[PDB]
Design an enzyme around this catalytic site. Sequence first.
Site, PDB file in Angstrom:
ATOM      1  N   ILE A  10       0.804  -1.213   0.000  1.00  0.00           N
ATOM      2  CA  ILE A  10       0.000   0.000   0.000  1.00  0.00           C
ATOM      3  C   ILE A  10       0.841   1.269   0.000  1.00  0.00           C
ATOM      4  CG2 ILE A  10      -1.348   1.469   1.519  1.00  0.00           C
ATOM      5  CD1 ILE A  10      -3.140  -0.859   2.133  1.00  0.00           C
ATOM      6  N   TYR A  15       6.702   5.010  10.260  1.00  0.00           N
ATOM      7  CA  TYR A  15       7.135   4.024  11.238  1.00  0.00           C
ATOM      8  C   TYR A  15       7.380   2.672  10.581  1.00  0.00           C
ATOM      9  CZ  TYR A  15       5.780   7.269  15.000  1.00  0.00           C
ATOM     10  OH  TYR A  15       5.684   8.339  15.863  1.00  0.00           O
ATOM     11  N   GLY A  16       6.513   2.300   9.647  1.00  0.00           N
ATOM     12  CA  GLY A  16       6.678   1.027   8.976  1.00  0.00           C
ATOM     13  C   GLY A  16       6.127   1.008   7.567  1.00  0.00           C
ATOM     14  N   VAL A  17       6.087  -0.180   6.976  1.00  0.00           N
ATOM     15  CA  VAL A  17       5.575  -0.352   5.626  1.00  0.00           C
ATOM     16  C   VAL A  17       4.180  -0.960   5.705  1.00  0.00           C
ATOM     17  CG1 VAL A  17       6.620  -2.624   5.501  1.00  0.00           C
ATOM     18  CG2 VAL A  17       5.930  -1.457   3.408  1.00  0.00           C
ATOM     19  N   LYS A  33       0.232  -3.308   8.804  1.00  0.00           N
ATOM     20  CA  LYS A  33       1.365  -2.424   9.031  1.00  0.00           C
ATOM     21  C   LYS A  33       2.377  -3.111   9.943  1.00  0.00           C
ATOM     22  CE  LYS A  33       2.795   2.221  10.412  1.00  0.00           C
ATOM     23  NZ  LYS A  33       2.637   3.384  11.337  1.00  0.00           N
ATOM     24  N   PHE A  74      -9.632  -2.393   6.002  1.00  0.00           N
ATOM     25  CA  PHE A  74      -9.164  -1.957   4.697  1.00  0.00           C
ATOM     26  C   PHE A  74     -10.135  -1.035   3.961  1.00  0.00           C
ATOM     27  CE2 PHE A  74      -8.605  -2.407   0.114  1.00  0.00           C
ATOM     28  CZ  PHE A  74      -7.231  -2.071  -0.003  1.00  0.00           C
ATOM     29  N   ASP A 119       0.550  13.922  11.929  1.00  0.00           N
ATOM     30  CA  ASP A 119       1.150  13.773  10.610  1.00  0.00           C
ATOM     31  C   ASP A 119       0.103  13.559   9.523  1.00  0.00           C
ATOM     32  OD1 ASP A 119       3.210  13.488   8.647  1.00  0.00           O
ATOM     33  OD2 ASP A 119       2.978  11.306   8.797  1.00  0.00           O
ATOM     34  N   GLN A 123      -2.136  10.992   1.821  1.00  0.00           N
ATOM     35  CA  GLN A 123      -1.868   9.558   1.877  1.00  0.00           C
ATOM     36  C   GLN A 123      -2.451   8.809   3.073  1.00  0.00           C
ATOM     37  OE1 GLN A 123      -0.110  12.207   1.028  1.00  0.00           O
ATOM     38  NE2 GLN A 123       2.021  11.578   0.717  1.00  0.00           N
ATOM     39  N   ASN A 124      -2.701   9.475   4.198  1.00  0.00           N
ATOM     40  CA  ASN A 124      -3.306   8.746   5.315  1.00  0.00           C
ATOM     41  C   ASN A 124      -4.759   9.110   5.585  1.00  0.00           C
ATOM     42  OD1 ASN A 124      -2.566  11.181   7.017  1.00  0.00           O
ATOM     43  ND2 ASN A 124      -0.545  10.232   6.818  1.00  0.00           N
TER      44      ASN A 124
HETATM   45  C1  LIG Z   1      -0.359   5.310   4.999  1.00  0.00           C
HETATM   46  C2  LIG Z   1      -1.431   4.379   5.478  1.00  0.00           C
HETATM   47  N1  LIG Z   1      -1.548   3.884   6.698  1.00  0.00           N
HETATM   48  C3  LIG Z   1      -2.657   3.049   6.818  1.00  0.00           C
HETATM   49  C4  LIG Z   1      -2.895   2.421   8.188  1.00  0.00           C
HETATM   50  C5  LIG Z   1      -3.398   2.918   5.630  1.00  0.00           C
HETATM   51  C6  LIG Z   1      -4.577   2.232   5.193  1.00  0.00           C
HETATM   52  C7  LIG Z   1      -5.573   1.732   6.091  1.00  0.00           C
HETATM   53  C8  LIG Z   1      -6.690   1.098   5.498  1.00  0.00           C
HETATM   54  N2  LIG Z   1      -6.784   0.990   4.158  1.00  0.00           N
HETATM   55  C9  LIG Z   1      -5.812   1.480   3.387  1.00  0.00           C
HETATM   56  N3  LIG Z   1      -6.059   1.310   1.996  1.00  0.00           N
HETATM   57  C10 LIG Z   1      -5.415   1.955   0.846  1.00  0.00           C
HETATM   58  C11 LIG Z   1      -5.917   1.569  -0.419  1.00  0.00           C
HETATM   59  C12 LIG Z   1      -5.394   2.117  -1.619  1.00  0.00           C
HETATM   60  C13 LIG Z   1      -4.341   3.065  -1.558  1.00  0.00           C
HETATM   61  C14 LIG Z   1      -3.811   3.472  -0.314  1.00  0.00           C
HETATM   62  O1  LIG Z   1      -2.794   4.381  -0.313  1.00  0.00           O
HETATM   63  C15 LIG Z   1      -4.343   2.923   0.885  1.00  0.00           C
HETATM   64  N4  LIG Z   1      -4.744   2.080   3.853  1.00  0.00           N
HETATM   65  S1  LIG Z   1      -2.612   3.887   4.424  1.00  0.00           S
END
Ligand SMILES: Cc1nc(C)c(-c2ccnc(Nc3cccc(O)c3)n2)s1
Length: 290
Positions: A10, A15-17, A33, A74, A119, A123-124
């Site tokens: 994703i 902090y992590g991937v 994560k 998700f 933060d 993206q989040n």
């Molecule tokens: C940075 C992120 N941290 C978290 C915990 C994220 C997260 C949680 C739940 N669902 C998603 N889905 C998602 C789907 C498509 C593109 C994308 O960047 C993220 N991402 S994205």
Amino acid sequence: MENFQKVEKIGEGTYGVVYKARNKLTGEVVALKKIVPSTAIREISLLKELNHPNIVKLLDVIHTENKLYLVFEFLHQDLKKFMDASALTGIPLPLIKSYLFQLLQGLAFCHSHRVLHRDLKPQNLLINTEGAIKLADFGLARAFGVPVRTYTHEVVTLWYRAPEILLGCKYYSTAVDIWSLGCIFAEMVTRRALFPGDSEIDQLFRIFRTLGTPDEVVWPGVTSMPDYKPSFPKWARQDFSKVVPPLDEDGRSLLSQMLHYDPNKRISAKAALAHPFFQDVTKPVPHLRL
Ligand SMILES: Cc1nc(C)c(-c2ccnc(Nc3cccc(O)c3)n2)s1
């Protein structure tokens, strides 16, 4: 941990991937994560109790041998991706307003619990086909500490960083999120980053060039902050008419109150929800391409 089949990557958190994954058991899809401090364990375990319509639900926490995994509900898209997909046309105001309104609801909820995101960025912020948007990675900042890069030493942006944090304030407040949401709101409207700074000082100077160099008049105590330099150039404040075209006045006024220098002057999420701008707010559905 062996009950999850990684499907895709994703993104690259601070902090992590993050990975899209399937629970080999329940067969459910989730955002996994990977990231130890015990104080942290308790810290995040408290976040698992955060249940709000606009907060990406933290399903489980898995700590196993010098490793920490976070399981999140998700969602199908992040706000960046979506904005890029709408660069040519731009998100309709009704949708923008709705997102902003929901986001503030969530922030208000977290802030009423003394929890900060720290933060915020496109993206989040995650969106679904239902037209709902949500905050992701809330509270984690406090769970640990903010680094400079990541594992790929790639880029985590300062673009949405509030002035107080950039000037060294050690004990910033919930007001730092509003500022971030503030900058994000602008980007949606103009389809461009409000303050795309390539370095801390550049990030500070862009804000200055646009909002004017702050002083004790607009920001009491500003000159006594850790990184304030009396040697800062002095720029004039530009009118939002040129900042957020063509945003109406209600939004512009609401925006300027989210971008106030003095954190104690910056509008709260709770108050923002009462702003005239949301008088005619609705909940449109987005056109998501998956
Ligand atoms: C940075 C992120 N941290 C978290 C915990 C994220 C997260 C949680 C739940 N669902 C998603 N889905 C998602 C789907 C498509 C593109 C994308 O960047 C993220 N991402 S994205």
